[PDB]
Amino acid sequence: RWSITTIHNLFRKLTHRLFRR
């Protein structure tokens, strides 16, 4: 369970390798 409200932006690119979906 990944609860990322706005931070999702700093992850969508940072962890894009994992959250590529």
From Swiss-Prot:
Which tissues is it found in, per the record?
A: Expressed predominantly in liver. Also present in plasma.
- Which residue ranges are recorded for the region named Glycosaminoglycan-binding site? 1-21
Q: What is the effect of changing residue 13 to N?
A: Reduced heparin- and no dermatan sulfate-activated inhibition
**Role according to the record:** Thrombin inhibitor activated by the glycosaminoglycans, heparin or dermatan sulfate. In the presence of the latter, HC-II becomes the predominant thrombin inhibitor in place of antithrombin III (AT-III). Also inhibits chymotrypsin, but in a glycosaminoglycan-independent manner. Peptides at the N-terminal of HC-II have chemotactic activity for both monocytes and neutrophils.
Associated clinical condition = Thrombophilia due to heparin cofactor 2 deficiency: A hemostatic disorder characterized by a tendency to recurrent thrombosis.
Please report which protein family the annotation says this sequence is part of: Belongs to the serpin family.
User: Could you identify this protein by its name?
Assistant: Heparin cofactor 2
* Source organism per UniProt: Homo sapiens
Q: Gene of origin? A: SERPIND1
